[PDB]
Amino acid sequence: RRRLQRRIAGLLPPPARRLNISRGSEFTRDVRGLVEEHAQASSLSAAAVWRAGLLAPGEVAVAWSGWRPPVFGDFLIHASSFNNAEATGTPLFQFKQSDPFSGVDAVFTPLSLFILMNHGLTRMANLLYDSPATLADLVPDFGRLVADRRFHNFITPVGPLVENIKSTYLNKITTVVHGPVVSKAIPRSTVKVTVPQEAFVDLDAWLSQPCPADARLYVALTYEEAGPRFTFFQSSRGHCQIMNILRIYYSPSIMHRYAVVQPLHIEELTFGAVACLGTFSATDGWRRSAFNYRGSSLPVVEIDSFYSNVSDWEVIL
Amino acid sequence: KIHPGVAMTVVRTDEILSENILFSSRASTSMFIGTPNVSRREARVDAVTFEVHHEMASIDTGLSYSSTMTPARVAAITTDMGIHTQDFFSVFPAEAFGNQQVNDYIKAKVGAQRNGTLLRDPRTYLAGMLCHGQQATCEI
Amino acid sequence: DPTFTERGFSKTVKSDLIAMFKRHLLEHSFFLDRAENMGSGFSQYVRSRLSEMVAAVSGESVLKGVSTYTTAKGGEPVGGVFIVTDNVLRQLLTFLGEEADNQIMGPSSYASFVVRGENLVTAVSYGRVMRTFEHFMARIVDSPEKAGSTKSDLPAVAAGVEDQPRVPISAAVIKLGNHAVAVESLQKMYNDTQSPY
Amino acid sequence: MDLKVVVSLSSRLYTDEIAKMQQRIGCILPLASTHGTQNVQGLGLGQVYSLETVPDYVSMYNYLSDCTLAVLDEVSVDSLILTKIVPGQTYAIKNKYQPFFQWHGTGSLSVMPPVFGREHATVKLESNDVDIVFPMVLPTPIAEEVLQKILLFNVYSRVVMQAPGNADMLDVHMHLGSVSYLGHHYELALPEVPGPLGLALLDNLSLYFCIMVTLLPRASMRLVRGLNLFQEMVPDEIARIDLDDLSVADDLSRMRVMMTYLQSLASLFNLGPRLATAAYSQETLTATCWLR
Amino acid sequence: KFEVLLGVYTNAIQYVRFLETALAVSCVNTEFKDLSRMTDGKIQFRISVPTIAHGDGRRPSKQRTFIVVKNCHKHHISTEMELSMLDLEILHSIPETP
Amino acid sequence: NEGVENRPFPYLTVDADLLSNLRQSAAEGLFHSFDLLVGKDAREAGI
Amino acid sequence: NEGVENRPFPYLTVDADLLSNLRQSAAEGLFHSFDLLVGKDAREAGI
Amino acid sequence: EYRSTVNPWASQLGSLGDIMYNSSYRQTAVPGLYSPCRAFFNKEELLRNNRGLYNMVNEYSQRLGGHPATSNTEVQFVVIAGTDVFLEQPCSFLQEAF
């Protein structure tokens, strides 16, 4: 009954949320304990681990805040299939391979996906990948898998890259599949998801009341007449709205697909699919930039502060 | 067993394991030892996947070569220097003749489709997907 | 061997060196395989091939002048190390004699390149740090009329590799005449980890 | 923040019960409550997938989407210490299911109620008279294909027990007897004799689906007469100009029951409690997943 | 009638330092603590080549000088060790019974 | 490549001669980053 | 336009406030070269 | 010098040896088998070694730029993983067989 007191005194304390500040010039111990957050990294010493508290269970606590650590999904890829000059924050799209026991993976950035679709944006695609044939056999039968319009249920978005070690023959990437996208380096710095500007469109800008707490990034494969395209939507609504909103936005191209060809078949009838990619702050995100290569540059959409959270593929019609 | 009009040559490769030497001069490179760092990466309910980080930076101190490597002795010959012509019905499987009868007969009379289980490097394959040493691949 | 590389490279000199590659590949490829053919000039044969190895290497490092590693028993600089397997280490110990030393003097701890104040100022402002700012300021501010010599610049190249206590590490020390190279095998370090050497 | 749901047994187990349980030390099961101790009658799918009543996919799926789920961790002789899945954290599950569908990394897992027979997913406890039924956990594309292929097998078995002049029993079996995903070509255990008058699994879902697509064409006719020309070129016109006169009470009743049978079915083909994996390592048959 | 156990034996791991092995004569090391912040290194050599005054009339190579620079290259090693949460909870707790 | 700095540095007088097979090595490109100053390229450049 | 180095300098506090019509100036481009840091990104960058 | 070729069915640019062997290998190619003729017939591989003597001597030791074969398998494959293989093939260097 007193052992329970000493135990419940340790299991009691929630983090002190409010605090009576007196003067901002004071910077006393209470406000430092409010602003201090423990790191996921320290040097391998006894004092550094025992002060950073790396061995704490569940979270990192020196010796439940709305903060959870992320989860990494590491893939091993053919090093020719992934141009290593790409930045940290680019959304990768792992193709579910038809090989039964293959331990090698086939990820795609959307730039590498563009030369897969078609076979400035095209200039940076062909400068980043001089070879449209070593990716045309990663998918073994692209013409069949698109001509029966089942390409959307084979591509699993795995969120953005965070760290990529450049090995020579078989490349190892570390992505973030779910949660808060943040770097793991010895100086920690911010990671920003970069999507190409010509591919990225907006949805509040296309429509031109309330402000939400977060906006959700959407990816959208769609089967047109001239091949598939990977547009990237950003929306601040909910999903069940966005299905009807993109049905309105594609209601031109739905009539165009029924018009320029008549679907005598039955597997052609789907018109793309959309999958949520996660939430970011709806206020100051997607500040544009340009991704500078050795000789050229494409304009890029640099979404800061991503919470990666993949959803599944829902058809559009 | 009569000769055709042509006369092929046969190319192989023969893996020879050695036990190499390595020399390098005194103070060939100058390196910087970074401080090791510990970082947890996946923290599920039952176990927490740790990861240690370490980084070094290596730079030269001379211009020309300062390290060398020679194969001292043969340990053994890891391949059999034999006769294993690699199957062109497997490296170009999309090629097919006129009829299906004649194609099937030709695939019957030769060693066609003999190992269709592995068609890649099996190190890339996972754990658990002609019982002699390593066949040197002949080519015509 | 500079005896062919003096008149400049051409088609002819490059062809000559390709043919001499082919000759050295067909004659002196495995220097321990055809070592065991002859037995009389045999310690001298391995001795000659290893002296050829330390003669075909280029020891012109800029850290040549500073004494980092010496033999414990005599003040002789090491001048290179040999990395071999276990069986070749045992064979070379028998063939080059058991007269190897057991230890060499070396640095106890590493040197320290901590970014001091002025280099921190340059790193903060531009992000370009110069090694040993004290020597740059001592050259082109304090009397730049002083011309540089090797004897003047021996503390400039040797930053902190000279102010370390010498403690002996254990290594077999064979002599190819005037050098004292050091053979060693790390297969011991790689065998317990079930890892390919 | 602790998660140990230690369910206590009244009468302690034998050895062979522990021998069956230690081969299912990584599967998940639905609880009844999220409380610190429980009894055995709240565990996985006993009360709804019992052997004494006719079972249906609908109420099993509703109960499975209803309550919390829980991977099990330890099996003592008289207690089963386990942990429940909250959406905040991520867990380590194992594919120890008797129809062994090979998982993959970064795949999405569907917690399905068992279709492949009760005896494949059970731990028949005798010391206590309970049947711990474990729910089927298998990847979502395989879940979709196995639902389509159990459903069409149900409809096609029902029409050939309706009349043998409809179809051939090998023809339905040489297509729907196998599920294919990434080359892993499985074979499905099919109950070739389900028995008439229902009394079997997947009748209530099949009855719902067949009533839905029966009421579908006049529903489409009513909802195109309510409102254009593109919508009147994709279907054939014999499904367009069919009736145009039904009694309004029966029309409204048919449309309402079609709407309920559509919304339940469409909520059902979304597989409910869906889990999303990160790094499935089949050297130890471990998948790392979270509640999605 | 007993079954006897005679011994549990566990190996002692050897620790191998870089300053202890004989590969450290091959390279000179300096403890640069904040290395991952440094983007790139650069060494620079100015090599002046003295030449020989000859007799005959040749096209004379004048005072030559070689400026060669060499870069450093990073090397990033990382392995994974695992620790069960049970051991960590036992670690950050306090015991009272033997 | 000739992306070399080429500024008048305080250069360190080191003992070891590196001139052995030097011009022949720079002729066939042992280095990616090197500069050949001949005659009146060999002035220390301006600030 | 994003031309600034954005490094943590030792900045100097002046006597004269410069705050008038500032966001209005940066909205229309009185300054050719500038960088706006809002909230989170207003930290000093890393060395 | 008294002839051009020892054979005209593999030395010419459109000859049969350059038909069945000059196909450039991709690291994703689903046949993936090892070839010994592609170290001798691959055209851009046959012009890779024109970059100077010291450049290709550096490339002999830096990377396995030729056509390397895998080891310890039943039939030799094109090595893809290569995480712990060590091989120096001088048939990619000087293009001459014994």
From Swiss-Prot, chain A:
GO terms for cellular component: host cell nucleus; viral capsid. It is found in: Virion; Host nucleus. GO terms for molecular function: DNA binding. Keywords: Capsid protein, Host nucleus, Virion. One of its GO terms (biological process) is viral capsid assembly. Pfam families: Herpes_VP19C. HAMAP family: HSV_TRX1. Interacts with TRX2, MCP and capsid vertex component 2/CVC2. Belongs to the herpesviridae TRX1 protein family. Structural component of the T=16 icosahedral capsid. The capsid is composed of pentamers and hexamers of major capsid protein/MCP, which are linked together by heterotrimers called triplexes. These triplexes are formed by a single molecule of triplex protein 1/TRX1 and two copies of triplex protein 2/TRX2. Additionally, TRX1 is required for efficient transport of TRX2 to the nucleus, which is the site of capsid assembly. This is Triplex capsid protein 1. It comes from Epstein-Barr virus (strain B95-8). The gene is TRX1.
Swiss-Prot record, chain C:
It is found in: Virion; Host nucleus. Homomultimer. Makes the hexons and eleven out of twelve pentons. Interacts with triplex proteins 1/TRX1 and 2/TRX2; adjacent capsomers are linked together in groups of three by triplexes, heterotrimeric complexes composed of one molecule of TRX1 and two molecules of TRX2. Interacts with scaffold protein; this interaction allows efficient MCP transport to the host nucleus. Interacts with capsid vertex component 2/CVC2. Interacts with the small capsomere-interacting protein/SCP. Self-assembles to form an icosahedral capsid with a T=16 symmetry, about 200 nm in diameter, and consisting of 150 hexons and 12 pentons (total of 162 capsomers). Hexons form the edges and faces of the capsid and are each composed of six MCP molecules. In contrast, one penton is found at each of the 12 vertices. Eleven of the pentons are MCP pentamers, while the last vertex is occupied by the portal complex. Belongs to the herpesviridae major capsid protein family. This is Major capsid protein. It comes from Epstein-Barr virus (strain B95-8) (HHV-4).
From Swiss-Prot, chain D:
Keywords: Capsid protein, Host nucleus, Virion. Structural component of the T=16 icosahedral capsid. The capsid is composed of pentamers and hexamers of major capsid protein/MCP, which are linked together by heterotrimers called triplexes. These triplexes are formed by a single molecule of triplex protein 1/TRX1 and two copies of triplex protein 2/TRX2. Additionally, TRX1 is required for efficient transport of TRX2 to the nucleus, which is the site of capsid assembly. This is Triplex capsid protein 2. It comes from Epstein-Barr virus (strain B95-8) (HHV-4). GO terms for cellular component: host cell nucleus; viral capsid. Interacts with TRX1 and major capisd protein/MCP. It is found in: Virion; Host nucleus. Belongs to the herpesviridae TRX2 protein family. It holds the Pfam family Herpes_V23. Its main location: virion. GO terms for molecular function: structural molecule activity.
Swiss-Prot record, chain E:
It is found in: Virion; Host nucleus. It comes from the Viruses. Self-assembles to form an icosahedral capsid with a T=16 symmetry, about 200 nm in diameter, and consisting of 150 hexons and 12 pentons (total of 162 capsomers). Hexons form the edges and faces of the capsid and are each composed of six MCP molecules. In contrast, one penton is found at each of the 12 vertices. Eleven of the pentons are MCP pentamers, while the last vertex is occupied by the portal complex. Belongs to the herpesviridae major capsid protein family. Homomultimer. Makes the hexons and eleven out of twelve pentons. Interacts with triplex proteins 1/TRX1 and 2/TRX2; adjacent capsomers are linked together in groups of three by triplexes, heterotrimeric complexes composed of one molecule of TRX1 and two molecules of TRX2. Interacts with scaffold protein; this interaction allows efficient MCP transport to the host nucleus. Interacts with capsid vertex component 2/CVC2. Interacts with the small capsomere-interacting protein/SCP. This is Major capsid protein. It comes from Epstein-Barr virus (strain B95-8) (HHV-4). The gene is MCP. The chain holds residues 51 to 148 of 1381 of the full protein.
